[PDB]
Amino acid sequence: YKDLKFPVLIVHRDIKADTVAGERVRGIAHELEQDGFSILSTASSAEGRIVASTHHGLACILVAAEGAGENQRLLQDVVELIRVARVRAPQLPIFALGEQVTIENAPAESMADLHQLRGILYLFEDTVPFLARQVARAARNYLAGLLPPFFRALVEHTAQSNYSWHTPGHGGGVAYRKSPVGQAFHQ
Amino acid sequence: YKDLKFPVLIVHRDIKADTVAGERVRGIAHELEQDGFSILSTASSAEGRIVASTHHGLACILVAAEGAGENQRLLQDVVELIRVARVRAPQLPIFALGEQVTIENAPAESMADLHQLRGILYLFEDTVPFLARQVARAARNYLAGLLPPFFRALVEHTAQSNYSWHTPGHGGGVAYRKSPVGQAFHQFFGENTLRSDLSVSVPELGSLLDHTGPLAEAEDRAARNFGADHTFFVINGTSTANKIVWHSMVGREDLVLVDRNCHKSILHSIIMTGAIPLYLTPERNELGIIGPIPLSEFSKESIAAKIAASPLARGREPKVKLAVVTNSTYDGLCYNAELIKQTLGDSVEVLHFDEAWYAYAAFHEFYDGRYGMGTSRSEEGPLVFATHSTHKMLAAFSQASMIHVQDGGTRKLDVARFNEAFMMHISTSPQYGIIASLDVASAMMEGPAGRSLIQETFDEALSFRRALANVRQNLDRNDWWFGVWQPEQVEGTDQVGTHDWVLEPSADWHGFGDIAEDYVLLDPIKVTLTTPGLSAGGKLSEQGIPAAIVSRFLWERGLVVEKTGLYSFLVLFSMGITKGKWSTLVTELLEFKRCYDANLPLLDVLPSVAQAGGKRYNGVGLRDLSDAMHASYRDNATAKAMKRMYTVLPEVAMRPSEAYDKLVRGEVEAVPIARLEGRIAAVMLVPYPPGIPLIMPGERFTEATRSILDYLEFARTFERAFPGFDSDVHGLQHQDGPSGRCYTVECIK
Amino acid sequence: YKDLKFPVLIVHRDIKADTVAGERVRGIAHELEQDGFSILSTASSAEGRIVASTHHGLACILVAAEGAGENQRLLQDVVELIRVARVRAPQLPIFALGEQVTIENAPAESMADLHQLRGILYLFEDTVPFLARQVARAARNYLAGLLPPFFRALVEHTAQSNYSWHTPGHGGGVAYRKSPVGQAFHQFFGENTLRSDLSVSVPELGSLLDHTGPLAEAEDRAARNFGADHTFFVINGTSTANKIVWHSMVGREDLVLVDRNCHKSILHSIIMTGAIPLYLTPERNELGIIGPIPLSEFSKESIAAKIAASPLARGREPKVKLAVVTNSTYDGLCYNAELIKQTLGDSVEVLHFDEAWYAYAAFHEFYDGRYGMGTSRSEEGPLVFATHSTHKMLAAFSQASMIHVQDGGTRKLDVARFNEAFMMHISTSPQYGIIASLDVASAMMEGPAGRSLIQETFDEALSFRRALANVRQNLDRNDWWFGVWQPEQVEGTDQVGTHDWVLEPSADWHGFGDIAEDYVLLDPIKVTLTTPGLSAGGKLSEQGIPAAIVSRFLWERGLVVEKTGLYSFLVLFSMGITKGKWSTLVTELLEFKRCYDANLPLLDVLPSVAQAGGKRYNGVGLRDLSDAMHASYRDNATAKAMKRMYTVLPEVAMRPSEAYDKLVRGEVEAVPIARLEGRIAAVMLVPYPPGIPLIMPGERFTEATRSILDYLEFARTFERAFPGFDSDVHGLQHQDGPSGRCYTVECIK
Ligand SMILES: *Cc1c(COP(=O)(O)O)cnc(C)c1O
Ligand SMILES: *Cc1c(COP(=O)(O)O)cnc(C)c1O
């Protein structure tokens, strides 16, 4: 929200992350930053399978998939990253990436590859600001869905409160700007 | 232009791109930037052969060539890049680069190397700012050449307009800065939409109804793209684009052959005509899919039997006019237009293909002979009209509808006598986006530009139909998955052939018995998902999942799936899908039978009906909500009645012309559903989603043989026993008040 | 929102704004910028009382108040700023500022000081980031409250849409990234236009034809704005918005009272009805201005005489239905709608005001009782329909047309029987801009928001009519200037009164003899310029300037001026003019009689006809091109024939229903202009610009008494003796070929 600096892990290959020759993954990092998102870039698979495995509150995950290379274990690396992702907060939307035919030839790994991914981001063909707007839609959709009911209502009560006059008490931390002791308590 | 941020791909070697030691390629990137161009640099060949291959609008392409290295495959890499470039927009100027002797020794590759390159840029020897000025000349030359005529004139009308005073209306988006509501509207809609919706305009842009200016060069260029002798844009919608060709055709006592898979626009256009129609109800399967028509009802004896079958008015054997048949029905049954021609052309002198979802049909090698514009015009005089609806499928703006005409034989009549009935259904506010959009949707398909575009949407659909039955290789113990309607040989993205996609005659992977010879080629984009619960053995098995809840699941998850048929979960792929949206539909169907075997309470996953309707289904799982509603079509015999209520010919007691003037007269009164058996209905009632116009205005019920009440009373107890649901029958006047959501229809006293 | 860059005006004293020594006002500008707000700082009071007074969309206003200084007029300056703020959008939250005791001592100014301020911002004591958070709360609260219902739902539908798969069509502007032509279309039209034209959509936004969702809260909020019991948006145009209320009304043998200043849409809607009409041709002056109707043709004896005057079919005295009369005709003759009511309500049970240019009529104190929605509904049952055309004047998008209904007396009938004929003229592609725009053009006029908007367009028009006759105080030796059609007492921006703008009965500043009592209040926005050359003494004087060339001058200079009448150069001001476009029209008319006394060759200033038609008028001045064409209406007696050809009742031999089915039959054949005297015309021929439908389909010429040929042969020799010009008669089938541009019309053999 105005708070909730929850990052989005971006995994892509080291030739095609923090590098050159076709860069819309950095563009959909930058547009998410203009939405107000953090970015945990990662240059390889196993360096992402650590940061996703530790106890982060991760909004989305962006994986690089290429499908046919199972003895290459690239699709197999994707399904390892998805499995290690969905263990402590399974509703976080894992997205794939890819510039060409991506999971159009998945041989038999589809119970956790095509089943858990909440969309593919064909980063060249698709719609770059509306692409990152779709990512930010699913991100904040899950970020609103993960809050419990009472805390969701209480965090949407301290943005759109009773407008000018909630009468008894400090009224939203307003009587704690009336004295130096109170303002020390306030800050 | 001032817009059009179209990039220019630059491919050069990694030692000599984004690097050092002789750099004029970066100089001719920088001077193009000072012209106002984007730059897609690329350090190698195969990284450029991807970005050029994806569906960019690319202005130019700059390749690095060195000629003699064919076993080095550098010239061979150049000709690969050129070939993969010119597939979707072949007029984009590909330029080469090079510092020394470049293609001065090309051995034998010159049919696509020296033939397609629109110049070489010897970057050292040549003339660096005039070099990039030449590149920018060819770039903006092609960028002006790729726009269609009407859109080119309309984009050069909102830069050099009528200068200070274009008088009626908002005048270029000027009255939308006079209020906060207007200025919010202004900053929402952009500026170039307001500044291009002229309220009345003749001069340089050409009024629609007079067929002048560049608009008559947008029409009759659409004739050379789609295939016609004269086309006409129609803007008030396809529900008026049918009405124009109905109304410029016969509007009097004569008889008209209509099908009974028409939309609610075609009977409305009968009422504006004033004609008594003849109906050809098609046969369906045992699932709910509206099936195809028999061509034996098209020879010159069956409609002659239909002439005597008209109860009210019996014409004296006319040449039965204005044959309407919904080519490519809702779930993808593209007919053979040529086999409607060769079966029908003697008795019908005006043909009318409502190619509504069949908008892309003229731009593939798969629908050949199968759309009403490709018929190879013969000497009989058929006059086939093809009233497209290009706001679905072939993407124009809303309400945009072309009308395609081709002549032949004995009746041409379309010089001016069509324009004097084209005027009385279109407004007098031309020169705007929906006419401009409808010339981009006919210029996105210029030659091989769109043939290699709907070949892409097969690649998203025949790699959805693959990878949806390619979850049946997983845990599928006996039979438990959505039966896709291609369960035989065609599983996979193998080939798009015009003889393995045709429904086989009297086969058993469709269910429509006695299919005629090579008639009904299924559309590989309208993937017709059948949810489990209705067997192909004849009647229901008790493992059903209802039509709504499988949609209402991914409704809240955020997909919209069309519905017609009883369990037929029809997903419609289109040209307006992002590349990679089969996998969201895969995931949010593999999530459906991961929260149905669990059978959670419906308030936990469906806030559409349950968690906002929190009284009736508190703590009620989907599985019994299925299996009670799965039996509710059976203990009412309503799935039997779906066979019954379509196959009956309703007793035509009033023409729809004369069953509509008894609505302004006062003869329409509230007749409830009980005593309907013997009073003529005067309102169009359509069961929508699951099919056709059941009862037209003028379809009198004879007795309980008119067995449609088994669904009208089914829809009542659907909405009564369970909240917001299939109370979906369009035209059902629901009175609100004393009784428990009891319904009433209109009739004639 | 993500859009809506709406500013917030900040007024503070010049010692304490953009300055030093206690600065939290700049801090609450900066925190609002970090919210994403614009800032219009202002250093003093009267510099803020200008920017707040101009037509901004202002979110908040921050004023500097100090209370006790009323002879200092600081609190008085605050209440002046508040009063000038709340005139065009009164709900904008005005906040005060102040560092000490601020309005704790307000003596007696509290009805507009403490009453209108929505809070005080004590900028030192209060809570700086939560302070600007409170300001941003009230700002975005009002910014959400000012949007109308349908547009609010449609702007919160293109942020949180159907997530991955909205299936038919371009799906949110996604198929417009699949080709270079499509991507050029994409970057031209913006993104929020493509992403908001849904091809088919029910769910949260509400389909038009079912009248559900927020669309039925856009309708029946437009009823509380315009004044009605139920309104209906209509999107296929006003040429269908007339057709809906014609077609939901009588469509059979019954008689219908129509005027003869109808557009080419109203006779077209007769043809869809099928009814025999009765005509009331109004009388005109000797200039060409189509004059007003007599109300004596509305009492219950004159139309009873018209019933027997119907030659073909004579009804047996019906309650003559569906009275259409073009309220506010083309040059601004707003009728008295209440005096059509009080003269007509007995004999006519459905009234139909085609308030096309009379779109703004419900939002002033000047047209009171004068628009068909303000009639003070009586117990007679009149059913007045007001089919607006709000793509001119009151600025909606193109083809947007409301239809206003109010009930009364004996016939209500509009619950569902209107919706079952509203469907058959509108398409089934809802939820988009033209429905969304048509709810902004009814929410730009919420209360006093638009009453103080068309009061502004009088201030541009009654300060054009002032400063155009205020060049007649310059060198005007005898009489040489465009005679504006207000040459008497009303010269100047004095007052907009409902009794000094009415045409006086039997006066001589209009020419329409025997004007009835308080009937025809002229519209002060449609300034009716009469060029010199036709005298008010009866016939032409030889100092004429032709209708076209005075427009064709400022056509190339870049103004568009409407044309109807023989010399009547009608300029139409609108709400879509920039503030300060009377002075361009002043300059490019004072330039006209600075390059007409010079009388230059027409190729030097008019490349429309001459310098691109460089054969006929090489070295030919305007003045003789005037004075030959100025006599060409006289030696043909065509300006006499304009009186003749309108006042005749053409011999009604065919109904326009039955004179149109003889076009698809084949009875339309090419009958040239010579032998027309005695053959029934079957095509609508309208002399446009200069008037009305002359001959409907079915208007048989009797003999040379039908003297219309003096203009048909005038138009021929106009285009023959001089290139592109008044060959303007709409419907004239010009064959191209052997003869010298000879014309042909259609008839019935
Ligand atoms: C969807 C559809 C339409 C849409 O028509 P509009 O008038 O463009 O809304 C028309 N005809 C058919 C057969 C359709 O299926
Ligand atoms: C200009 C005008 C119109 C415009 O109608 P559309 O159908 O909105 O183009 C309609 N009626 C009249 C009387 C007009 O003058």
Coordinates of C-alpha atoms in Angstrom, one line a residue, chain B residues 123-367:
Chain B
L123 CA 29.2 3.4 -42.6
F124 CA 32.8 4.7 -42.9
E125 CA 32.8 6.0 -46.5
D126 CA 29.4 7.5 -46.6
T127 CA 27.9 10.7 -45.3
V128 CA 27.1 10.3 -41.6
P129 CA 24.3 13.0 -41.0
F130 CA 22.9 12.6 -44.5
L131 CA 23.4 8.8 -44.0
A132 CA 21.0 8.8 -41.1
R133 CA 18.9 11.3 -43.0
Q134 CA 18.6 8.7 -45.8
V135 CA 17.7 6.0 -43.2
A136 CA 15.1 8.4 -41.7
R137 CA 13.9 9.2 -45.2
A138 CA 13.2 5.5 -46.0
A139 CA 11.9 4.9 -42.5
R140 CA 9.3 7.7 -42.6
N141 CA 8.6 6.9 -46.2
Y142 CA 7.5 3.4 -45.2
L143 CA 5.9 4.7 -42.1
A144 CA 3.7 6.9 -44.2
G145 CA 3.1 4.1 -46.7
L146 CA 1.9 1.6 -44.2
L147 CA -1.0 3.6 -43.0
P148 CA -4.3 3.0 -44.8
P149 CA -5.8 5.9 -46.8
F150 CA -8.6 7.0 -44.5
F151 CA -6.4 6.8 -41.4
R152 CA -3.6 8.6 -43.1
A153 CA -6.0 11.5 -44.0
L154 CA -7.5 11.4 -40.5
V155 CA -4.1 11.6 -38.8
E156 CA -3.1 14.5 -41.2
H157 CA -6.4 16.1 -40.3
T158 CA -5.7 16.4 -36.6
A159 CA -2.5 18.3 -37.2
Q160 CA -3.6 20.8 -39.9
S161 CA -7.3 21.0 -39.1
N162 CA -9.8 23.7 -39.8
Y163 CA -7.8 26.4 -38.2
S164 CA -9.8 28.4 -35.6
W165 CA -13.5 27.6 -36.0
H166 CA -14.9 24.2 -36.7
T167 CA -18.3 25.0 -35.4
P168 CA -20.8 22.3 -34.2
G169 CA -19.9 20.3 -31.1
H170 CA -16.8 20.0 -29.0
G171 CA -14.6 21.2 -31.9
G172 CA -11.6 19.1 -31.2
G173 CA -11.9 18.5 -27.5
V174 CA -12.4 22.1 -26.5
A175 CA -15.6 21.9 -24.6
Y176 CA -14.0 19.3 -22.3
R177 CA -12.0 21.9 -20.5
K178 CA -15.0 23.8 -19.2
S179 CA -15.8 21.8 -16.1
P180 CA -14.1 19.4 -13.7
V181 CA -16.3 16.5 -14.9
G182 CA -15.4 17.3 -18.5
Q183 CA -11.7 17.7 -17.7
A184 CA -11.7 14.3 -15.9
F185 CA -13.2 12.9 -19.1
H186 CA -10.6 14.7 -21.1
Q187 CA -7.5 13.5 -19.2
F188 CA -9.0 10.0 -19.2
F189 CA -9.8 9.6 -22.9
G190 CA -6.5 11.1 -24.2
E191 CA -6.4 14.0 -26.5
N192 CA -6.3 12.4 -29.9
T193 CA -9.6 10.7 -29.4
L194 CA -11.5 13.9 -28.6
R195 CA -9.6 15.8 -31.4
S196 CA -10.7 13.3 -34.0
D197 CA -14.4 12.6 -33.4
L198 CA -15.8 15.3 -35.6
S199 CA -19.5 15.9 -35.1
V200 CA -20.2 16.8 -38.7
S201 CA -17.5 17.0 -41.4
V202 CA -17.4 16.9 -45.2
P203 CA -14.3 18.5 -46.6
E204 CA -10.9 16.7 -46.9
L205 CA -11.8 13.5 -45.2
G206 CA -15.0 12.6 -47.0
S207 CA -18.5 12.0 -45.7
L208 CA -19.5 8.4 -45.3
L209 CA -23.0 8.6 -46.8
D210 CA -21.8 10.4 -49.9
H211 CA -18.9 8.0 -50.4
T212 CA -16.4 10.7 -51.3
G213 CA -12.9 11.8 -50.3
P214 CA -10.5 9.2 -48.9
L215 CA -13.4 7.1 -47.5
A216 CA -14.1 5.8 -50.9
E217 CA -10.4 4.9 -51.1
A218 CA -10.8 3.1 -47.8
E219 CA -13.7 1.3 -49.2
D220 CA -12.7 -0.4 -52.5
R221 CA -9.3 -0.9 -50.9
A222 CA -11.0 -3.1 -48.4
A223 CA -12.5 -4.8 -51.5
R224 CA -9.0 -5.6 -52.7
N225 CA -8.1 -6.9 -49.3
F226 CA -11.1 -9.0 -48.4
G227 CA -12.2 -9.8 -51.9
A228 CA -15.3 -8.0 -53.2
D229 CA -16.5 -5.7 -56.0
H230 CA -17.6 -3.0 -53.5
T231 CA -17.6 -2.9 -49.7
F232 CA -19.3 -0.5 -47.4
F233 CA -18.4 0.4 -43.8
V234 CA -21.4 0.4 -41.4
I235 CA -21.0 2.1 -38.1
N236 CA -24.2 1.7 -36.2
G237 CA -23.4 -1.9 -35.5
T238 CA -23.9 -5.3 -36.9
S239 CA -27.4 -5.2 -35.6
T240 CA -27.8 -2.5 -38.2
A241 CA -25.4 -4.0 -40.7
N242 CA -27.8 -6.9 -41.0
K243 CA -30.6 -4.4 -41.1
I244 CA -29.1 -2.5 -44.1
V245 CA -28.8 -5.5 -46.3
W246 CA -32.2 -6.8 -45.2
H247 CA -33.8 -3.4 -45.8
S248 CA -32.1 -2.6 -49.1
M249 CA -33.3 -6.0 -50.0
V250 CA -37.0 -7.1 -50.0
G251 CA -39.2 -5.2 -47.5
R252 CA -42.7 -6.4 -48.5
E253 CA -45.0 -9.5 -48.7
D254 CA -42.4 -11.8 -50.3
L255 CA -41.0 -14.9 -48.5
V256 CA -37.5 -15.1 -47.0
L257 CA -35.4 -18.1 -46.1
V258 CA -34.0 -17.6 -42.6
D259 CA -32.2 -20.1 -40.3
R260 CA -32.9 -20.6 -36.7
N261 CA -29.4 -19.8 -35.3
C262 CA -29.9 -16.1 -36.1
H263 CA -29.0 -13.6 -33.5
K264 CA -31.6 -11.3 -31.9
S265 CA -30.7 -8.8 -34.7
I266 CA -31.9 -10.8 -37.6
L267 CA -35.5 -11.2 -36.5
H268 CA -35.5 -7.5 -35.6
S269 CA -34.4 -6.9 -39.2
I270 CA -37.3 -9.1 -40.3
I271 CA -39.7 -6.8 -38.4
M272 CA -38.2 -3.7 -40.2
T273 CA -38.6 -5.6 -43.5
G274 CA -42.2 -6.7 -43.1
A275 CA -41.8 -10.1 -44.6
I276 CA -43.1 -13.6 -43.7
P277 CA -40.1 -15.8 -43.2
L278 CA -39.3 -19.5 -43.6
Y279 CA -37.3 -21.4 -41.0
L280 CA -34.7 -24.2 -41.2
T281 CA -34.0 -25.4 -37.7
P282 CA -30.7 -27.4 -37.5
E283 CA -30.2 -30.6 -35.6
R284 CA -28.0 -30.7 -32.5
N285 CA -26.2 -33.3 -30.4
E286 CA -27.0 -34.6 -26.9
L287 CA -24.7 -32.1 -25.2
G288 CA -26.2 -28.7 -26.0
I289 CA -24.0 -27.6 -28.8
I290 CA -26.1 -26.0 -31.5
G291 CA -25.4 -28.1 -34.5
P292 CA -25.1 -27.5 -38.2
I293 CA -27.8 -27.2 -40.9
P294 CA -28.5 -29.9 -43.4
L295 CA -27.8 -29.0 -47.0
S296 CA -30.7 -31.2 -48.1
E297 CA -32.9 -28.3 -46.8
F298 CA -31.4 -26.1 -49.5
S299 CA -32.2 -28.0 -52.7
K300 CA -35.2 -26.9 -54.9
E301 CA -37.7 -29.3 -53.3
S302 CA -37.3 -28.9 -49.6
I303 CA -37.9 -25.1 -49.5
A304 CA -40.8 -25.7 -52.0
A305 CA -42.2 -27.9 -49.3
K306 CA -41.5 -25.1 -46.8
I307 CA -43.5 -22.7 -48.9
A308 CA -46.7 -24.8 -48.4
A309 CA -45.7 -25.1 -44.7
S310 CA -46.2 -21.4 -44.0
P311 CA -49.5 -21.4 -42.0
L312 CA -50.6 -17.7 -42.2
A313 CA -49.5 -16.4 -45.6
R314 CA -48.7 -18.7 -48.4
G315 CA -46.7 -17.0 -51.2
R316 CA -47.2 -18.3 -54.7
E317 CA -43.8 -19.9 -55.1
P318 CA -41.4 -17.0 -55.0
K319 CA -37.7 -17.0 -55.8
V320 CA -37.2 -17.2 -52.0
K321 CA -35.1 -14.2 -51.2
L322 CA -32.4 -13.2 -48.7
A323 CA -30.9 -16.4 -47.3
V324 CA -29.4 -15.7 -43.9
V325 CA -27.3 -18.4 -42.2
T326 CA -24.9 -17.7 -39.4
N327 CA -21.6 -18.8 -41.0
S328 CA -19.3 -19.8 -38.1
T329 CA -21.8 -20.4 -35.4
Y330 CA -21.0 -19.6 -31.8
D331 CA -18.8 -22.6 -31.1
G332 CA -16.9 -22.7 -34.4
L333 CA -18.8 -24.5 -37.1
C334 CA -17.6 -22.8 -40.2
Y335 CA -19.8 -24.0 -43.1
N336 CA -18.9 -24.5 -46.7
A337 CA -20.0 -21.2 -48.2
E338 CA -19.3 -22.8 -51.7
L339 CA -21.5 -25.7 -50.8
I340 CA -24.3 -23.2 -49.8
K341 CA -23.7 -21.6 -53.2
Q342 CA -23.8 -24.8 -55.2
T343 CA -26.9 -26.0 -53.3
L344 CA -28.8 -22.8 -53.2
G345 CA -28.0 -20.4 -56.1
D346 CA -31.0 -21.4 -58.3
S347 CA -33.7 -20.5 -55.8
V348 CA -32.1 -17.6 -53.9
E349 CA -31.0 -14.4 -55.6
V350 CA -29.5 -12.6 -52.6
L351 CA -27.3 -14.5 -50.1
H352 CA -26.6 -13.1 -46.7
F353 CA -23.7 -14.6 -44.6
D354 CA -23.8 -13.2 -41.1
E355 CA -20.1 -13.8 -40.8
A356 CA -20.0 -12.4 -37.3
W357 CA -17.3 -14.4 -35.6
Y358 CA -16.1 -15.4 -39.1
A359 CA -14.3 -12.1 -39.5
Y360 CA -10.8 -13.5 -40.1
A361 CA -12.0 -16.0 -42.7
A362 CA -10.5 -14.3 -45.8
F363 CA -7.0 -14.3 -44.5
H364 CA -5.9 -17.9 -44.3
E365 CA -5.4 -20.9 -46.5
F366 CA -7.6 -22.9 -44.2
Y367 CA -11.0 -21.4 -44.9

